[PDB]
Amino acid sequence: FSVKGPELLNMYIGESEANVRRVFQKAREAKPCVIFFDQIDSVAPKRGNQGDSGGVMDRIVSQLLAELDGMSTDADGVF
Amino acid sequence: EYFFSKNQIMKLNRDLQFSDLSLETEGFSPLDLEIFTEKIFYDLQLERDCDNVVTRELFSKSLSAFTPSALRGVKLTKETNIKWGDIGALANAKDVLLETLEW
């Protein structure tokens, strides 16, 4: 699976948070799968810096931290 | 005690009294009970092919494998199966968690 840089980010408030979850769900459908976060910088910037605005970059990285590891995780074949 | 009498002629064995079972069914609403009794009757009938209408162990063998009729939603993460003996440390936090949430 290719994550085309800041592909996930989106127009509206919550559709980025839907795109991330959809990506992980679909990958989880086929257990031996790979996720290639190319140029992670654009998607997972340092949380809560003063020199930033909008805050969505924080929400998305938080969602990443959640869904990627979280809890109840099983069938770890998702690299 | 009503339900078991009304559905079909059958009874709980002398091994146990209905008060215990009442204790066993915490939070089960009356329709849920109507479902549960039918479930137990089915489990007794042919899932065990015994020619009898009494039960003591079937409840423990099937109550857990049951979903209360109103109780579904965001599915509880009961599969993580982590025992507190796996955590080991964090006494200062373990005790406050156990007293606030568990006790």
Binding site: - | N7, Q8, E38, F41, Y42, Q45, L46, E47
Partner: protein, 79 residues
Amino acid sequence: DCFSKDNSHFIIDPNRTKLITTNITNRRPLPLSRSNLQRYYGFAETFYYDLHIFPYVRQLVNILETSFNCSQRGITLNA
């Protein structure tokens, strides 16, 4: 007819037989365990599960056969 002395077995003749029918009757089908009709007539055979191996099918068959056997018990336990 005049041959009423016996009625066990008889022939049907198109020169004498006519098509007459009554209302709809009822009768049980033939269990698969005793005769594979599809096999005989080359139909698209339903897959022959083996209850000793597949877990979930056993539950279904048990439920249905329970509802079948309760006929002579005579109660509305069907679920």
